Amino acid sequence: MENFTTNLNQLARVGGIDPLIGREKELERAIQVLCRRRKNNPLLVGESGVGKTAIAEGLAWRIVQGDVPEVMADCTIYSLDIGSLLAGTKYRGDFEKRFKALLKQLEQDTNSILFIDEIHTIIGAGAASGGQVDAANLIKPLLSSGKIRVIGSTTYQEFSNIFEKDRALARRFQKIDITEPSIEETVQIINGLKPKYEAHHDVRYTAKAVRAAVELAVKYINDRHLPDKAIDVIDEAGARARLMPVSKRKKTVNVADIESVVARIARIPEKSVSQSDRDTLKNLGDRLKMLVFGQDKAIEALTEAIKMARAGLGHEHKPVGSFLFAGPTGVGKTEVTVQLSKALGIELLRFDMSEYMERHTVSRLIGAPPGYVGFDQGGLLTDAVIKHPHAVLLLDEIEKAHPDVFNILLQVMDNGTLTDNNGRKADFRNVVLVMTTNAGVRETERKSIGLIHQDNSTDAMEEIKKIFTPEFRNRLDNIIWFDHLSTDVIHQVVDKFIVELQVQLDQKGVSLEVSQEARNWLAEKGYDRAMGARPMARVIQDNLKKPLANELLFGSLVDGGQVTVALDKEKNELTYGF
Amino acid sequence: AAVELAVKYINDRHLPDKAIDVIDEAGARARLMPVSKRKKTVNVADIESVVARIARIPEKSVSQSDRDTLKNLGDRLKMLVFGQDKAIEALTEAIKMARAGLGHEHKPVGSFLFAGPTGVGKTEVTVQLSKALGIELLRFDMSEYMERHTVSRLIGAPPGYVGFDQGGLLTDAVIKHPHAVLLLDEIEKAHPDVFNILLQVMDNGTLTDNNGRKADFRNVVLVMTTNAGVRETERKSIGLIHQDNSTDAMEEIKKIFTPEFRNRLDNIIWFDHLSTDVIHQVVDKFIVELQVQLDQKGVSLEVSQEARNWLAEKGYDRAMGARPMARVIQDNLKKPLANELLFGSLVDGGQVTVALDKEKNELTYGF
Amino acid sequence: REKELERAIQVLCRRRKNNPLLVGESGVGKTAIAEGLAWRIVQGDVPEVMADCTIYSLDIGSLLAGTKYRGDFEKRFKALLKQLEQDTNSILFIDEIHTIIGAGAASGGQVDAANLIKPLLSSGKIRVIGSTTYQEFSNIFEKDRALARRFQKIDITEPSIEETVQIINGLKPKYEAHHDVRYTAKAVRAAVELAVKYINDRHLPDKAIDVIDEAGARARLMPVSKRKKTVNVADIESVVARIARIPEKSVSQSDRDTLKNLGDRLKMLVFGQDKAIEALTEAIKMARAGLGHEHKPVGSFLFAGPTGVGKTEVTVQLSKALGIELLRFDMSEYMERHTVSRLIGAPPGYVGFDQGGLLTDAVIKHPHAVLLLDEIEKA
Ligand SMILES: Nc1ncnc2c1ncn2[C@@H]1O[C@H](COP(=O)(O)OP(=O)(O)OP(=O)(O)O)[C@@H](O)[C@H]1O
Ligand SMILES: Nc1ncnc2c1ncn2[C@@H]1O[C@H](COP(=O)(O)OP(=O)(O)OP(=O)(O)O)[C@@H](O)[C@H]1O
């Protein structure tokens, strides 16, 4: 007792314990257990960081304050330091000697309570070249006789996995569940605790700041539990605003600072648009339309979803956007998404649904069940989302995956959460789910038989409905049906590819100019409505790169200069030179 | 009473210690009661309260505030889920029979299978029921359980395997919250082999995880939501007259769920589609939620009545239930609102009025 | 890393659980970030709150060395804890935070360095900086809820191109002193860009610097005839090629000749069907001339025609003439849908998982090769 436990009453007398607020029924039942005749040993079990240790030390704090029923008055709770207890037990019997001496001291006191934090650790305290003769059994007979009182604290998992193993020790304690408090209890706890943090960080918290901290930590941080994550938000806000007086920012911590802390912790695009975040969102449709020609309404839908997200009008809990892009090949379905990722400056999560042809490939997405060979790997999808919570999720050619795999995205779109094999949950509320497919293509490109050609516009939707279950479609933000590229779009695509080729050549230090009629001839040569834009890339490659490759590989353009490409009219041929 | 209740509701210790602990805690409680000198005998009510607090289960509460909570539960839910009253009625009656003590022997509070077209309040009624009771909500998306060997994920890996020390998720959750609402979403999309776990649970209210530990489901409401049988109900027959395909819905459900599984259910509540007035109420609900979102930004909003009617007429889709209304309201309101909140008039200001003209059926905006 | 360093400093000055956790992919610079915080403290490039603070890198080996005689490890650990508590101005840096969840005494196996430290961290008594990769974190560290709760998660993200360029600029003098070689700015930028484009198995601030160091080391092995030189873009290209398997600038050698006479060297082996040799040579030339695709295979060709016309022979001869391996797959063996699992592997939890995929592994082992799909109509 001299130097192995710390007097918690002494701490509360010197203010070393943060004050216990609320927890009325919990502490009342802890006292009730303490007042039993036999096995008066309460065990505080609960989630990690919900106030179990807080309750245990707040009992002694209340004793010092005297706001306790007049049966635990003058009782002194001591926190056991197992670490220092085991320090010098090098020789046989030292541990048992010191432990039993402390035990008889506690027996003689008849007023003290021994609080053992993380009591699940005492299932072994030294069997070094020996048997079960450690503290796990030394403490057993004293509890059953009701001579001493011990308070335990452990999480549900550690309890179930370690403490429940020894039924003899397990039955000597009274399990008490410390549940996570609700909103009002948490904000009141913060109200009672924040004087100390204001003192430590030399700041002031507004009431709205505290309420916002509570609500945001609730709806944005799903890693931890309320009474600790809220005060963590508070502490980090205090520290940040305390580091600001380098420019003499002696002021209160308003709501905006709380949102800064929450966004920097949860890695979310918060803190209201502002600065230029507004400029970037404003001309995003432009920066995309200059790289994706035609199919502008897809860019419109994407930008509207992103803005609604940043404007605070997003969904309560859903991905930023859940889009199904369907249309013929080579019309920019994946390109608009990749360019959106590059424009926003965030991560692109590309997944090739063609690799998920079989039903049993779901385990590749979410991980293998426990006990199996691939358990230690987790799942690819959820791991990627957890690593990059703010990103764009691209699922290429979802019609190629097994029709059953869609049921994962079902829950992902509905709730924005996905649980891997470890019970961990990925947060999809900050991702844009975009799925590309060629579903309605073959049905729209059909030939009517009869004297009257029919309207086949609805056939793309018919095919998509036949492929995707009604509940899967019912969770999509919108289905943007892409149309084929028109000839002016083809000219613009040819120009974009010319710019790409020019960049490639500038890398080699040579310049290229292509006459306008040459561009027109290339467009008229390569245009194929049924195949979109890839034939343009092919024809441009064949017509320009191959002659250019020969010219620069074999001397004529080695460290060359200007490439002179123009079109003649008699043969529709191109010119070349240095 | 101490003996009987410690037997029936404590299953972690052995009888000669269970009863002694019940009696000792009752004595300590009656000894702490006389802070106002109420040194009394231990009545049956005190023993019942002690065991209920030990078993973490609800006691007799026909007088407390939760009696009123149960009194107005059906209405406090009907204000959030419009139509489909029979589901709310069944849920509330099951919760009452459990709380009234006139419950099932050792079964869960209620075992209900919710089936019907998508986009209706099958899962939403469950979320709002968990909120209205203030009890934990355990959500399990059975779509993550397509393979038959994912049962190991539910109940844990057998001893002598890599995933043993983690334990099952379902049993661990129920251990953490013995009084909760258990939501199993899209169970027909899980592997049909998984249904046998639910067989065992529904019949006995107990479940043994990998550690031989038994989870107690007697105080957990079991609600499972499916979209099974919907294809037939909405499938058009060929002929001059269409048939009620509800018989086909029943046939499909029986195809998917073995006879004993259907026998271990409290009821199968067939959710209906949403009517037009129900659509109007849904529009009102979503507009209220949008108004809350805007007030978070400091923007008041007023939407006219005929604008509401026009939104409902534009978004009404019988096949998809209430979900299309979300998109309709989204595009028709949030888009101009997002523009005005980002690079427009509604930056730190509100008073946005939306009204419908009759020449173009368009919306008004602005300060 | 001023943003991340500022986040770390903000975390350290907190009242409770003021223990930042540097989480990031390997090679990103987590250990580098901690030791550079120490370095800037030495140079005073810190806010006054962290000034005059001493960071200690905790060694686990020497801490557990010889800790027989139950209590030796505990006594030693508590002695370290007491020295740090008395210092009141020290931060303990644990390079591998996921490795302190076990400290022997498997009998019972509970009183380890993890449970020994939780009271200190929860009380805000001591400041410790951790570091771990993402998978180690999520599979080893975060499993201990109470320990993960006492640490503040900081994501150390992969830097950008220009950030990498500046990092290499700042690190260059040490590599110069080590190799006695000098780097040109164009060479550094080329190293960064080529490492991004062609090296796929590492992350920027550890693979661009890898190219820099290896170029310096090889140019240090050039003065066997005393070829004293600075590192130009050419050496960088050679280095990045030794991993990408195709040099871009070495084409100024006889590689130009091999390209030029390739069509003929094939025509002497494949008679007729000149169109195929022409197409293949044009594709390979466009690739080697830098005009090829930046994210596509060198060439994707479907050869169709009657039997015995040289469809398979021309590809084998092309592989021979180029000196590259022939990744040969017969699509008649993949006549069934489920056979794709041979090419890509089985999902986790299934019998063939640890084997991997045939095609992907063959491609990874041979980054530069010709892929032949015999009888594709049979798959
Ligand atoms: N009633 C309370 N009053 C004030 N703070 C509380 C209360 N309950 C919890 N806390 C906060 O939680 C922290 C203490 O956590 P607690 O001891 O409850 O969990 P724990 O013992 O750390 O759990 P584990 O052993 O799983 O880590 C304190 O920093 C405090 O801010
Ligand atoms: N609107 C467009 N503007 C510019 N380039 C385009 C456009 N549409 C297609 N492309 C070209 O096509 C390539 C990408 O095509 P994309 O991935 O969009 O096709 P897709 O719609 O996915 O068809 P599939 O799924 O069948 O491949 C780009 O390299 C780009 O040059």
Ligand SMILES: Nc1ncnc2c1ncn2[C@@H]1O[C@H](COP(=O)(O)OP(=O)(O)OP(=O)(O)O)[C@@H](O)[C@H]1O
């Ligand atoms: N009765 C209702 N009242 C109000 N809103 C409803 C109702 N039914 C559904 N909704 C809307 O639908 C959303 C919840 O959908 P839910 O999860 O119930 O779909 P579901 O029944 O699972 O369909 P599926 O299983 O086919 O996906 C809520 O956001 C809510 O706005």
Ligand SMILES: Nc1ncnc2c1ncn2[C@@H]1O[C@H](COP(=O)(O)OP(=O)(O)OP(=O)(O)O)[C@@H](O)[C@H]1O
């Ligand atoms: N901020 C930085 N400035 C310059 N170089 C850095 C920086 N961060 C990392 N590096 C480079 O990375 C190397 C050190 O690796 P670092 O400590 O960053 O990660 P690590 O210790 O390898 O991580 P782990 O411990 O997980 O393996 C150094 O050689 C250095 O060149």
Ligand SMILES: Nc1ncnc2c1ncn2[C@@H]1O[C@H](COP(=O)(O)OP(=O)(O)O)[C@@H](O)[C@H]1O
């Ligand atoms: N055009 C050709 N020139 C020279 N040899 C040829 C030609 N076509 C076929 N052969 C010979 O016939 C054999 C079969 O050629 P291959 O291309 O593999 O046939 P397939 O097209 O059926 O795969 C080869 O070994 C090759 O030597």
